[PDB]
Ligand SMILES: NC(=O)c1ccc[n+]([C@@H]2O[C@H](COP(=O)([O-])OP(=O)(O)OC[C@H]3O[C@@H](n4cnc5c(N)ncnc54)[C@H](O)[C@@H]3O)[C@@H](O)[C@H]2O)c1
Ligand SMILES: NC(=O)c1ccc[n+]([C@@H]2O[C@H](COP(=O)([O-])OP(=O)(O)OC[C@H]3O[C@@H](n4cnc5c(N)ncnc54)[C@H](O)[C@@H]3O)[C@@H](O)[C@H]2O)c1
């Protein structure tokens with residue numbers, strides 16, 4: 001059978017997706033440059049070594065950079081792909097503002113190179129990791145797919161928006177292409193085994209991992225970025241979605257490609273928003289630990305609330321997020337507890 | 346630190362700007378890969394060989410691709426540039442629609458690589474070839490710099506907008522950068538000698554070379570892309586600007602950089618729009634020939650009408666386009682007539 005190329009597959013979302021692909025019967029080939037994934041010293045990134053263990057199925061892997069055209073060329077010659085799921089990229093907002101060129105290079109040039117090879121090799125079937133960030137500051141809520149996109153505030157968000165645009169143009173230009181752009185909301189949680197999850201290096205920029213790190217006792221308290229927002233409790237409201245649900249949405253997307261769907265765009269969110277305080281309360285509950293916090297200044301670029309209108313995905317992808325708040329917290333806690341320092345032995 | 350690097354210097358706008366540079370006392374270094382240029386009889390592309398003749402000055406040139414990192418690196422090690430004028434890229438609205446990836450690769454990836462090399466060598470002064478296409482479908486006329494940018498109608502325009510955006514980000518991250526973004530309107534005309542001008546390969550994509558070719562009898566007739574636009578005669582309205590005036594605008598831009606201007610954006614237009622039909626008329630008058638045209642469908646990617654508000658350039662660059670319609674046609678005609686087959690065969 002033909003394979004499924006998974007770029008950046010050793011990462012957070014990708015590893016979970018590889019697991020789901022294997023469980024669903026697909027044959028994945030992962031490529032990763034270890035920019036944000038732990039090695040271990042063996043042939044696989046630790047995340048994938050564990051996915052193999054958990055599923056009892058092999059993960060084919062090639063260490064490589066999407067910026068390496070020559071390596072991409074050889075890869076497409078070595079394997080017969082039927083689709084590509086593209087997670088590879090840089091995603092640190094703060095870092096993007098500081099080093100815009102790095103983001104444009106990895107994100108834009110890398111994606112362009114990958115699209116050229118796919119075109120060249122006749123693998124015109126893509127699933128792309130996009131983000132609700134492309135919508136910019138919400139003009140209305142919930143955010144549906146027709147909400148305006150662009151006018152992003154940082155280089156990171158801009159790069160995702162530009163990528164979306166490039167893919168739209170490609171599909172318009174060649175009707176034989178099929179591409180599903182998935183706008184993730186706030187991915188959280190980990191596989192139920194507690195053996196894989198998000199492995200942030202240093203201080204996590206996202207709320208959840210910070211909260212769990214406070215709970216585990218690695219951090220003293222949570223700094224809450226403002227409490228004067230226009231929300232019920234004044235703290236920011238987001239659509240947290242279980243990474244496992246998110247991963248399953250990728251399989252639904254592959255199925256969509258098989259229907260020769262052309263260019264499709266879907267939000268991958270729950271449609272339910274929770275505030276920072278509500279997330280802390282739930283994590284207290286899942287962890288059985290106290291989670292102290294302190295209200296600090298607002299974070300530059302943050303908005304009051306951001307949550308999805310997941311109807312389209314349900315309708316067309318037949319996908320809906322299954323796991324709730326408690327499950328997300330329980331699963332995150334399990335991973336955190338079982339792996340206090342993330343990956344290694 | 347004396348030289349000025351000119352990418353795509355063998356092309357239409359580039360060759361003319363090389364000439365103005367020489368005459369203004371600058372020391373240009375030109376690089377071109379001949380995608381849309383004519384390899385002379387020697388090393389130099391024919392255009393530059395002629396430029397040398399006209400100016401009595403020498404042109405340093407190096408054949409290379411902005412896509413070649415290695416070559417760029419060497420180049421920047423070889424010379425000490427005080428600034429860069431970046432003309433290299435793909436430039437047709439309609440063709441972009443059918444070939445988005447080529448535009449994205451050459452324009453975006455080419456520009457990013459260029460910017461990385463510049464930054465890495467402390468060459469932080471730039472003159473960029475932007476376009477009125479970044480304004481997308483005009484919301485009002487004439488177009489001032491503050492008119493919204495983005496929401497482009499074609500990949501070419503999207504590519505230019507994205508580049509503008511990246512540059513703005515770069516300048517933010519590094520205050521020491523000086524970058525002048527020139528939104529050219531429709532370049533036309535030719536050097537007064539008739540020795541150089543636009544030398545399109547195959548069927549001309551743009552209005553004037555096609556019109557002129559009909560006149561010299563190289564084309565049977567002109568195809569007019571739609572007559573149902575919201576314009577006086579229903580045909581496309583554009584701000585045609587003489588290539589010589591554009592070139593002079595570039596010297597003014599180089600001067601602007603001396604003020605440690607940072608990020609600046611200026612329209613380079615005349616402020617006068619002309620219809621497709623009006624252009625034909627003017628060329629009929631200039632060539633005294635018969636110019637037959639067939640009305641056809643609207644072309645994907647084209648806007649109805651667009652012309653510049655050139656106040657800002659006037660005020661800040663101390664620049665205005667002098668050359669009028671008759672002059673542009675006479676100049677275009679002279680070049681066409683003296684060079685019926687372009688720079689050679
Ligand atoms: N995590 C989120 O909250 C979030 C939200 C929306 C969208 N996204 C997007 O989803 C994707 C996956 O996000 P994630 O949370 O799993 O991040 P991640 O960093 O864990 O995974 C990305 C993977 O890409 C690899 N990579 C980076 N640059 C590479 C390159 N040049 N070549 C090859 N591999 C390279 C990294 O080493 C890493 O394993 C990213 O594109 C991200 O921008 C994530
Ligand atoms: N031409 C217009 O009507 C217009 C108006 C707005 C913006 N611009 C821009 O100004 C620039 C020059 O326009 P022009 O009319 O002179 O076009 P042109 O095609 O004559 O000039 C572009 C030049 O770049 C060279 N080139 C292309 N790809 C290259 C690569 N990868 N490496 C090196 N050289 C390469 C081509 O060979 C050519 O000599 C382009 O960026 C164009 O988009 C022009």
Ligand SMILES: CC(=O)N[C@H]1[C@@H](OP(=O)(O)OP(=O)(O)OC[C@H]2O[C@@H](n3ccc(=O)[nH]c3=O)[C@H](O)[C@@H]2O)O[C@H](CO)[C@@H](O)[C@@H]1O
Nearest residue numbers: 093131133205206207210223224225236237238276301302
């Ligand atoms: C500016 C920024 O980072 N935007 C990113 C962030 O948005 P986003 O704000 O949605 O997600 P975060 O995880 O960073 O924050 C969620 C909420 O928690 C708050 N919070 C967060 C961390 C913390 O220590 N304290 C605290 O109070 C934030 O203000 C917000 O209200 O995550 C999305 C998912 O990765 C990305 O696509 C966005 O690009």
Ligand SMILES: CC(=O)N[C@H]1[C@@H](OP(=O)(O)OP(=O)(O)OC[C@H]2O[C@@H](n3ccc(=O)[nH]c3=O)[C@H](O)[C@@H]2O)O[C@H](CO)[C@@H](O)[C@@H]1O
Nearest residue numbers: 436437438476477529530531550551552555568569570581
């Ligand atoms: C190839 C070229 O130089 N394109 C330039 C032109 O774009 P632009 O697309 O406006 O230029 P064109 O010469 O292709 O089009 C001008 C007008 O002429 C019409 N037309 C054109 C050709 C033809 O055979 N028949 C016909 O009717 C078009 O529909 C349009 O209304 O100016 C822009 C700035 O404004 C530049 O950024 C572009 O680089």
Ligand SMILES: [Cl-]
Nearest residue numbers: 003078079080
């Ligand atoms: Cl294979």
Ligand SMILES: [Cl-]
Nearest residue numbers: 099100101102
């Ligand atoms: Cl940078």
Ligand SMILES: [Cl-]
Nearest residue numbers: 444445446447
């Ligand atoms: Cl293409």
Ligand SMILES: [Mg+2]
Nearest residue numbers: 138139140141
């Ligand atoms: Mg409003």
